[PDB]
Design an enzyme around this catalytic site. Sequence first.
Site, short mmCIF file in Angstrom:
data_model
loop_
_atom_site.label_atom_id
_atom_site.label_comp_id
_atom_site.label_asym_id
_atom_site.label_seq_id
_atom_site.Cartn_x
_atom_site.Cartn_y
_atom_site.Cartn_z
N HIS A 178 38.65 32.45 41.32
CA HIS A 178 38.75 31.86 40.10
C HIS A 178 37.36 32.17 38.70
O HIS A 178 36.48 32.28 39.44
CB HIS A 178 38.94 29.88 40.34
N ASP A 179 38.45 32.65 37.86
CA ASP A 179 37.01 32.61 36.50
C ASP A 179 35.73 33.63 36.73
O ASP A 179 35.18 33.86 35.92
CB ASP A 179 36.57 31.71 36.17
N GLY A 229 33.99 32.10 43.46
CA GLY A 229 34.13 31.57 41.72
C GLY A 229 32.94 32.16 41.00
O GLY A 229 32.63 32.63 41.00
#
Lengths: 255, 255, 255
Positions: free
Chosen positions: B118-119, B136
């Site tokens: 994620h991200d 992340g």
Amino acid sequence: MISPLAYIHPEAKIGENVEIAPFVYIDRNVVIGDNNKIMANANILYGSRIGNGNTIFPGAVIGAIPQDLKFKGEESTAEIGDNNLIRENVTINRGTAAKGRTIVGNNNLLMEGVHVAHDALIGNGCIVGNSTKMAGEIIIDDNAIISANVLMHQFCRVGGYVMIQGGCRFSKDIPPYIIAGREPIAYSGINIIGLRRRGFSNEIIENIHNAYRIIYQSGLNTSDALTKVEAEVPASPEIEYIVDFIRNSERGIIR
Amino acid sequence: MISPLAYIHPEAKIGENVEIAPFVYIDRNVVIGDNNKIMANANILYGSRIGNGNTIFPGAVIGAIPQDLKFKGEESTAEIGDNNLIRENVTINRGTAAKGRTIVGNNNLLMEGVHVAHDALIGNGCIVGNSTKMAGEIIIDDNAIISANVLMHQFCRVGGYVMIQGGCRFSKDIPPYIIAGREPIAYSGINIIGLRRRGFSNEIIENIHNAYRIIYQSGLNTSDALTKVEAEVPASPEIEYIVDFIRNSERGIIR
Amino acid sequence: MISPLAYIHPEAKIGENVEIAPFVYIDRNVVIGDNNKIMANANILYGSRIGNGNTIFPGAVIGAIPQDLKFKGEESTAEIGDNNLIRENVTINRGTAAKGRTIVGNNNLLMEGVHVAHDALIGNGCIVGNSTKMAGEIIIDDNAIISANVLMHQFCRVGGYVMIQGGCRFSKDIPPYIIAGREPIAYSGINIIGLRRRGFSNEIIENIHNAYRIIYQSGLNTSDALTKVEAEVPASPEIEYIVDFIRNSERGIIR
Ligand SMILES: [Ca+2]
């Protein structure tokens, strides 16, 4: 809810409010509970037992035969409990005659590519990072956090509230509440972050820290250390768990 | 071109000259550009954004929800640009509220089993080896080469033209143009092979080498080293990139 | 036996008593022998050649194009022999012009997530643990045991009856009969367990041990060590294999 593009053997037992995506393959001798979400291209094979409230991501494979060449086609299961997150390409093989059941508990997160070998046991509330490999007949106690690419040798046990750092490998037991890191793996202090986050008192945290100073940093052998912990650290269920875990350790503990 | 044995949600937006194999699963809230090849048993999930000219190999999963337990069902995307090679079982999760978009640029090769959390942000022209795990909110600058089984801790950044050796792990930033290797990870000289192969002058290569002698091998602290690099190494965009990257490093740089 | 929910290109050649599950994708320019079991969601791609008696688990991908950016669309194959166990998400890429054929022999176990790169060669009777990565143009001799998460650099060779410990990485050759472990990787004695289990005499085991004492523990350079092994260790095919392997080693051997 159940896609017509899934393959589901007519003998599979499937609970209520179960969502099954296209290209899911579900065998006979499968039990699936209520409120499960099984995403596309996942495989639930002969011998799987699934509880309630889980999500099984694409490409996960539950219940394949052991990778153990000692396997001779005996009946066994691969089981998960409730409320788990079983990520992409996670493999949970069914058991062998050594035990007969590969078991994962409740409220775990098994990140993508994690492998759970025959007869392994995972408790509750654990997080297991990307592509970690749990070998045959391991045991993971509740609330453990294991990072990515960890290699856990057969028959090892990990205690509750441990944090194991990414890429570590080990072939001894890891006692509860510690950080294990480096190469070769080593006791690297207490999981203060995890314990604080979960509401343990500063006082109990300090006691745990003191028990491990005695165990690892006082030059005492295991017996003498545990004697001294029992004599000198204010007793609590946490301290008794540390002592019992080490005292009965099947493999010995890590350095 | 579009197989009738694929599942494609009627709301998915799909460009021209897109080849889709059997057993591909494409969700709603998906955008796919032109000239893409999506191979069998790949999964393109809610929130995916795909550019032009990519090939997505069997078992890749794009757009699954974050593995972050802080995720609470917020809207987010997982995005790739143009001309990427997304190999077997690559996972690119969509974003969290921390940013909202997991983004991969153009002309990358993500080898099998690579995870993009994620991200995370990947630039252009990168090669990322088998089963490397990007945690992340990481950042990878253009033209990096990362070998297999690398573990890149959350929030880290890798500079352009780096070569990271297989099996390494790190939780600091890696500055541009270097080789990073060993355990614990370490500056291991300059990526001379990569730079020569890409046409950098021997003179610019020597300047880069001299900047890193100052930075790593002169006994100076970071500030003083960067001062001396600015004073003594013939200035060029490459040298300014080294300086700026280190000077503004969020995590600090590796040893 | 052949599921109607598989996709099988009409040009694929398929032998007798072949079981094919739903969501299997089989391309043209594929050859599959007799008595094979291909489980759900496996992918057999253009250029694959499969022998007899194999089991291919869910999510395995055989025959995808090389991950080598030097590949330019040349014809090549990915091949397995007989009686192999090809586990979940195993990848076997087809070859490049460097050779043209990725080849796996007979009676191997390739555990989940194992990668076999373009032009690699695996012999017979090998076990390769979870998510081990075999890079381009490697060679594995018969009867080797490789644990999980091992990184085998391009062009390396592993001798028969070796045991490589989990998580190790190497970029030199590994000579026959040894245990290789630690970081950096190192000769760690003889695979006595494996040799005893396979019926080698205690006498032959002792000779192998003595050859490696000479090679690794006597302070001699390679030439002199091999001279002394030839002069002083009772000769047998095992000892000649050790000598020949080292003497002609393309990369040099590990320390
Ligand atoms: Ca897969």
